[PDB]
Each structure stands twice: as structure tokens, then as C-alpha cells.
CSV table of C-alpha atoms in Angstrom, one decimal:
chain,number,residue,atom,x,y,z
A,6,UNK,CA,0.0,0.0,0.0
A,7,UNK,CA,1.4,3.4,-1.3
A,8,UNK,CA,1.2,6.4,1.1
A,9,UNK,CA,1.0,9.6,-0.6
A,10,UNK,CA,0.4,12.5,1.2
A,11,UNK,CA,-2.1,15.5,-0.4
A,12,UNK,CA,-2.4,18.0,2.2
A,13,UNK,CA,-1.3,18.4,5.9
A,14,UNK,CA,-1.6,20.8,8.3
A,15,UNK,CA,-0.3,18.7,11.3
A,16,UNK,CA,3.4,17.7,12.4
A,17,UNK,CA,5.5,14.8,10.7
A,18,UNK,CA,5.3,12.7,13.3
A,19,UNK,CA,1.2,12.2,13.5
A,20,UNK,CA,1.2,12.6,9.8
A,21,UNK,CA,3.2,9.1,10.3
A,22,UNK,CA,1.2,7.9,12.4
A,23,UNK,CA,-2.0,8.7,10.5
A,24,UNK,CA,-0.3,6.5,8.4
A,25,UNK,CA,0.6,3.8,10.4
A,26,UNK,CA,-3.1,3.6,11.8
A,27,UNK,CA,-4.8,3.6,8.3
A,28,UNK,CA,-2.7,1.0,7.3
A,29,UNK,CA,-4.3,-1.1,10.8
A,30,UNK,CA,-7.7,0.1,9.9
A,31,UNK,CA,-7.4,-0.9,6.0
A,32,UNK,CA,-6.2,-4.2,7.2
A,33,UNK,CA,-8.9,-5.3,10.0
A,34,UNK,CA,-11.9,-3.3,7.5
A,35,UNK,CA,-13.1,-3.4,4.2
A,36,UNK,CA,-16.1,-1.3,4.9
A,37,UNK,CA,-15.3,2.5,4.5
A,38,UNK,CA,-17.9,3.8,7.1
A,39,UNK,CA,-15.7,0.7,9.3
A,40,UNK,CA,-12.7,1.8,8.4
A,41,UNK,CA,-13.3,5.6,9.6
A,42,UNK,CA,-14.3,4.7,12.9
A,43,UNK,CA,-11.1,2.4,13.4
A,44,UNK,CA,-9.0,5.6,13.1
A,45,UNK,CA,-10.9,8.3,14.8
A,46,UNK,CA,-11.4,6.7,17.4
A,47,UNK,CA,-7.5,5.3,17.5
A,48,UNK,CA,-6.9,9.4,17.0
A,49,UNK,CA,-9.3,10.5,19.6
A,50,UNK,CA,-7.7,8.3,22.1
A,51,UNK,CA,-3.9,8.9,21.1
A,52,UNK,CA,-4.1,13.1,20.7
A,53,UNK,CA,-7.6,13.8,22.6
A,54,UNK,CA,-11.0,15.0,20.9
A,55,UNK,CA,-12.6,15.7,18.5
A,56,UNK,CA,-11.5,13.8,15.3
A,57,UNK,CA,-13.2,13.1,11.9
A,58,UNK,CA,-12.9,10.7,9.8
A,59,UNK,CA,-13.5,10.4,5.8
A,60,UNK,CA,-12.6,7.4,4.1
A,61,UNK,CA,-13.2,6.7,0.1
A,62,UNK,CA,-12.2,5.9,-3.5
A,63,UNK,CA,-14.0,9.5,-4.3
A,64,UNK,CA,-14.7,12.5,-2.6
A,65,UNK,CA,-13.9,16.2,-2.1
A,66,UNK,CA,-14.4,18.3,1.1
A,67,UNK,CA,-14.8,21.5,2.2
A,68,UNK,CA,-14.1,21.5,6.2
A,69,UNK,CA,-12.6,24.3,9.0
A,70,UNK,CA,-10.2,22.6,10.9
A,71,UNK,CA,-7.9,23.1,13.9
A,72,UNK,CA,-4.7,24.4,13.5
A,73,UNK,CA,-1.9,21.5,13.4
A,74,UNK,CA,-5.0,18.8,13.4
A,75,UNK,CA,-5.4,17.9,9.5
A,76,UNK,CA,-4.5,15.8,7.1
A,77,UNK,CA,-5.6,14.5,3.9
A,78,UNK,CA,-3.3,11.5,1.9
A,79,UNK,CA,-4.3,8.4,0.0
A,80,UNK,CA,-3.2,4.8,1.2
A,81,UNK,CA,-3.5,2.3,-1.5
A,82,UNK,CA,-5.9,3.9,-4.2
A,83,UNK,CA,-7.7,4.7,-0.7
A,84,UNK,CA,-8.5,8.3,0.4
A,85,UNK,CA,-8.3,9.3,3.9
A,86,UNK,CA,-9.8,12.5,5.5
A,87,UNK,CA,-8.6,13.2,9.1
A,88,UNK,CA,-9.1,16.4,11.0
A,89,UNK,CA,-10.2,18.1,14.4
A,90,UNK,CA,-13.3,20.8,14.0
A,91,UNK,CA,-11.6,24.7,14.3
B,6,UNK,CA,-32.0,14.2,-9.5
B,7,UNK,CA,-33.4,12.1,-6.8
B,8,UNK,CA,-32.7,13.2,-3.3
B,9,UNK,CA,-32.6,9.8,-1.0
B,10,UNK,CA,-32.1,11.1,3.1
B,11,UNK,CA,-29.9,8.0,4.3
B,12,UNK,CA,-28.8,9.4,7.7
B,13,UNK,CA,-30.2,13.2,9.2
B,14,UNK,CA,-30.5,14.5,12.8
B,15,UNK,CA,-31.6,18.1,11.4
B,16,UNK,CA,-35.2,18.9,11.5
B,17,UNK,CA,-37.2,18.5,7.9
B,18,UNK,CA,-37.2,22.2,6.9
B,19,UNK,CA,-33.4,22.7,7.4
B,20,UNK,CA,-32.5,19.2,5.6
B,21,UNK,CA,-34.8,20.1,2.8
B,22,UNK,CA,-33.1,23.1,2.5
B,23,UNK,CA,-29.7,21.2,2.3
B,24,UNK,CA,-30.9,19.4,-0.6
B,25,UNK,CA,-31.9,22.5,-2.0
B,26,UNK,CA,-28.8,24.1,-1.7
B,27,UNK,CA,-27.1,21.4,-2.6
B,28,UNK,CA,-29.3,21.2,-6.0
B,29,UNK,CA,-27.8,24.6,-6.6
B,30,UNK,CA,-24.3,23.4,-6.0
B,31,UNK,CA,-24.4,20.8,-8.3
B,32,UNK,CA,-26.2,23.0,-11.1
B,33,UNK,CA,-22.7,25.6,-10.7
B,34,UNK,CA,-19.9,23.0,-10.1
B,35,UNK,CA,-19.0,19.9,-11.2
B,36,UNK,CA,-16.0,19.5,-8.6
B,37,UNK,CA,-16.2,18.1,-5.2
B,38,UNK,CA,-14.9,20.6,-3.1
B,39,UNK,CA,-16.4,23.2,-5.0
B,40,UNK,CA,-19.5,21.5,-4.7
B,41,UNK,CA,-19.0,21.3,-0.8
B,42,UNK,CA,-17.8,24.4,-0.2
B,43,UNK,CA,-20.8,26.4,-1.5
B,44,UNK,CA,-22.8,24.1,0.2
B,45,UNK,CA,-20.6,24.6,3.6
B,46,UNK,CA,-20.3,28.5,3.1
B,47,UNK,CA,-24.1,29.0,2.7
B,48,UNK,CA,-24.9,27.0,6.0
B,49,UNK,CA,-22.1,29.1,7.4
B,50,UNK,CA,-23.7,32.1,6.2
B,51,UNK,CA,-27.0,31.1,6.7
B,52,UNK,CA,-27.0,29.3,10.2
B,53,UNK,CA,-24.2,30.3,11.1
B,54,UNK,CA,-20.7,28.6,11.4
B,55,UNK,CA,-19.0,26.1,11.9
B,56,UNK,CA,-20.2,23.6,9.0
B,57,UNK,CA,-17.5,20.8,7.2
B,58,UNK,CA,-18.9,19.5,4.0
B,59,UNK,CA,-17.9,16.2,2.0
B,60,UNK,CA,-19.2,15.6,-1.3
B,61,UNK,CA,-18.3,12.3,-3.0
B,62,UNK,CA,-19.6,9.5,-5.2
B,63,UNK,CA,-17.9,7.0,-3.0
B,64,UNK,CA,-17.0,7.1,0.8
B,65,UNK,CA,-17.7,6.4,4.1
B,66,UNK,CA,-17.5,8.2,6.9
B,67,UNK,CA,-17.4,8.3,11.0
B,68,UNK,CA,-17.9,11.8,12.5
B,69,UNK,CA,-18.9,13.5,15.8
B,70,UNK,CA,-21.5,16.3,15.1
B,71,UNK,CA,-23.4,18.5,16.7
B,72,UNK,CA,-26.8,17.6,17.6
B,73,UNK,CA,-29.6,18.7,15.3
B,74,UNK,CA,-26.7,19.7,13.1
B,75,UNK,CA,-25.7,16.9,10.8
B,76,UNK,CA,-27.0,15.2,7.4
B,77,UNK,CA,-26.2,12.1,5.0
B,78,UNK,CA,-27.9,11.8,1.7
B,79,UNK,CA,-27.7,10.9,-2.0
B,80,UNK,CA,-28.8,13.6,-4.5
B,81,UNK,CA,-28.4,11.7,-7.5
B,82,UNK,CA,-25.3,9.7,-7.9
B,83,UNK,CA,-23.4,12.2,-5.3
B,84,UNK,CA,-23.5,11.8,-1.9
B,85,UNK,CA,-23.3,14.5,0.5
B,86,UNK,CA,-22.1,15.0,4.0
B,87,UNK,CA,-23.2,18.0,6.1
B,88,UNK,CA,-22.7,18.9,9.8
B,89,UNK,CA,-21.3,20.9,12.7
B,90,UNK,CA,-19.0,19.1,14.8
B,91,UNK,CA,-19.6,18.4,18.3
């Protein structure tokens, strides 16, 4: 699974982790919906409340988030949407 | 354009009007986060802020929203998510 990172306004380091906890997610789920809770509720326990998740082959968003608390990157052919509400 | 309401907690005036505007959105833009950023911006302008949007023709999704303040529905072949976060 290729990780490509789109857009990130959050620190290397939970980027990678993002990452990491995707990968667990995309591995455990095949249902999108599934998938997205696996890793905001992974997020909300690591780095506190309130995450979002956003999981799919196709979608665009529109969102206002928190500063250092986004990121948006593809895993596989995968697109992944995770964010704190600003 | 068939409207289908698959998940709402908003009361039936307010979710019709989120199909209506998104209608509107999908008549000026063909893009996703185009799309969901009109739609975000006029229920920021409209009720207020803060509103994320995600517009895609596949994806699921697992967020924490604000109660009274969060839709999930198909208009068409797009489907839209619209909340507040909690």
C-alpha cells in the first residue's frame, strides 16, 4: 500500500502515524464507514477529541479545521480524511 | 436528481433546504470541493458557522456532530455529508 500524502496541516510525526493507523484500519476493514471509525477513534484516544474521519475511492471536502490537526493522503488507491473541528 | 435522506438528525425544513442548496451546487460546479464548499459557506452564512462538508460519489464516513446539526444523503449519484462538529 502506497502512502501519498495530499495536504497536511499537522506535524511529521502524527502525519506518520495517521499512516501507520490507516494501514491497521485498511487491514482489520473493508467497509469504509468501518474503516473511519477504526482511526478516529485510535486518533481521539492517542491526541484527545474531537477527530473526523472520511474514508473513500472519491470524494472532495470543504471542512474548518484546527490548526496543526489535518490531514488529507491516500493509502493504496484509498482516500483518507482526518481532522479536528476549528 | 433524486434526493434519498440515508442518515439526518436536522429537522425537515433545514435538511430540505440542504438538498436545495445542494441542487444549486451541483447545477454551478462539477468538482467536489467546489461543490462542498458552497454548500458549507451558505450554511455558514446562513446558520451560522462552523459547518464541514464532504461531497463524493464513493466514501464512508465516521464523525462526531453536533446535535440537530448533521445530514447524510444521496442527491443523484453524489452523496453529501453535512454537519457541525460536536
Amino acid at each position: 500500500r502506497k502512502a501519498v500524502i495530499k495536504n497536511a496541516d499537522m506535524s511529521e510525526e502524527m502525519q506518520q502515524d495517521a499512516v501507520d493507523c490507516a494501514t491497521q484500519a485498511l487491514e482489520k476493514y473493508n467497509i469504509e464507514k468501518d474503516i473511519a471509525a477504526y482511526i478516529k477513534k485510535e486518533f481521539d484516544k492517542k491526541y484527545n477529541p474531537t477527530w473526523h474521519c472520511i474514508v473513500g475511492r472519491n470524494f472532495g471536502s470543504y471542512v474548518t479545521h484546527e490548526t496543526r490537526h489535518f490531514i488529507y493522503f491516500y493509502l493504496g488507491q484509498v482516500a483518507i480524511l482526518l481532522f479536528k473541528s476549528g
